[PDB]
Symmetry: C2
């Protein structure tokens, strides 16, 4: 039911995003010891890159229907949603860790190990929620055909609907849990971004990135929740909107992190070349 | 329908909270010229207290069941909650923004008219956003109390089962759209509020600085809304539990916000008056 043109355009856009991610990864691994790259925590950026590539992979997974090879659509939905959750956690953990380190250094002066441990605790919370969701009730797909008589007290209407969807029995409770924990994380991240407001340059100050990212995350998540809930008879629209939202959010966050590093690196190297001659 | 004991307990707690709000209003109006109250924003504190009164009133209205007209009751209890939350939280964001702009001035001071208009827009524009969303919800997709009898013949990969359920619930046809919208707008404004609280983290004292109240409020609001959405959706066969949880969440949030706003004002007011009395008696004795 998915048009080949939409699939091709979405695949090309996600591939370009993945190539940008790989370019940033190569830049931050090769130029680790440089001052501009080193002062921006190159080790904590690797986790953000991995989260971004995981999110792009989930966006790829959102575009396939039916089965892979006689497989279960339930497993596909579960794995792509859990991949998206883990990817967003890994994207947003390191940024908050960097902001917290900047705040603590500014105020009565933290190694990378403690920040990685906090990020690991965040990931453990997400993993616990995903595991209890999967074990308590899977996302089993059901064929619902039924006839219902509606009585509003003034008129009677009968409808016959044959609906098929893949969902949990109590899906809104897991939605509330995941969205709520993420939202508490985003509230504390906005607090941290405000605390480190105008404290350093954008390469070291990850405060505009947080404020752009949280707003994009909330907007995209709300739009896609509503669209998936109601416009389920529009597979092309749902697929395009989901992939576009994931791509836009991930690419915007990564660009906001890494464009300052690249331009400052270029300026520093050009200044060194001018001085040497 | 609802047990009289739970109704009595909830009514007592809501009335006590309302009396606390009235006492704070009386303190704000009477001691409006005091230095401790004046260095706060008493005119904005009034708006916060009216929002608190609206939230407590909606908490009262949540207890009426099987009496009314029921569609209008749900619509007006929910609109009252939305407007009360907007009126409670807008003033605090305005105070934080004013404290941030005062202590980050530069040569381009802009114009005082523009500053006052921005302060008014961090409150009235939010209230108008909620107003237009509620008007769109009411006019487009109003709550309808409808009873459905239905027989469902579901089938899994290998198992076939049949169910016959009849339910009486009140909701909109596209209720989750309006939920996502109101939750979304409130969440964006509360994210900006958390940003403002962080920006003014250690800029003044708790009576003037409002970062702790903002953070506690946004966290408690997210927790309460997340819990109450879920329990209202799923535990609809538990009227006493739903009513008690909704009233408790509203009461806890409103009381915590107002206590965080006003208890430090009372503490520093008492300290200031005690200092004044001590110096007065020392001067009179000599
Ligand atoms: C930085 C990059 C990351 C940002 C990407 C944002 C894009 C999100 C799009 C995916 C979310 C919509 C899909 C919802 C689930 C679905 O498809 O239905 C299957 C079902 C729900 O089905 P349903 O209810 O949508 O449709 C069936 C309707 N019915 C009437 C039958 C109920 O999923 C679940 O049961 C819940 C699973 C929860 C797992 C977590 C989901 C992934 C989390 C990713 C976002 C978290 C971070 C941001 C949160 C916002 C800020 C606080
Ligand atoms: C400062 C103190 C104030 C904070 C108090 C927080 C408490 C909130 C409790 C009320 C919310 C639960 C009730 C949900 C609606 C309902 O009753 O069902 C009727 C219906 C939905 O019914 P339903 O879907 O839940 O049940 C039917 C299930 N069914 C399967 C059929 C769909 O409501 C609506 O149609 C939506 C109306 C939206 C209006 C706004 C709601 C009140 C807003 C108050 C919170 C806003 C501020 C916080 C936002 C979050 C933080 C960013």
């Amino acid at each position: 039911s998915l048009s080949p043109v939409l699939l091709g355009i979405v695949w090309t856009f996600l591939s370009c995003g993945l190539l940008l991610i790989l370019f940033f990864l190569a830049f931050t691994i090769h130029c680790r010891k440089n001052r501009i790259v080193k002062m921006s925590s190159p080790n904590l950026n690797i986790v953000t890159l991995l989260g971004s590539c995981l999110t792009y992979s989930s966006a790829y997974l959102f575009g396939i229907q039916d089965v892979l090879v006689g497989s279960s659509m339930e497993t596909l939905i579960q794995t792509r949603l859990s991949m998206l959750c883990i990817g967003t956690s890994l994207v947003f953990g390191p940024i908050l860790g960097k902001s917290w380190r900047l705040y603590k250094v500014f105020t009565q002066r933290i190694k990378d190990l403690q920040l990685l441990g906090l990020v690991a605790a965040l990931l453990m919370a997400d993993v616990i929620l995903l595991m209890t969701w999967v074990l308590t009730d899977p996302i089993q797909c059901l064929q619902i055909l039924s006839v219902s008589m509606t009585v509003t007290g003034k008129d009677v209407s009968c409808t016959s609907t044959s609906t098929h969807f893949c969902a949990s029995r109590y899906s809104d409770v897991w939605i509330a849990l995941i969205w709520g924990c993420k939202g508490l994380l985003l509230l504390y991240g906005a607090y941290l971004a405000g605390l480190t407001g105008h404290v350093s340059s954008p390469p070291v100050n990850q405060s505009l990135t947080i404020m752009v990212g949280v707003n994009l995350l909330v907007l995209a998540a709300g739009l896609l929740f509503v669209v998936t809930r109601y416009l389920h008879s529009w597979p092309n629209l749902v697929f395009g909107l989901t992939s576009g939202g994931i791509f836009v959010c991930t690419t915007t966050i990564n660009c906001f992190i890494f464009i300052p590093q690249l331009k400052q690196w270029k300026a520093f190297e050009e200044e060194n070349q001018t001085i040497r001659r």
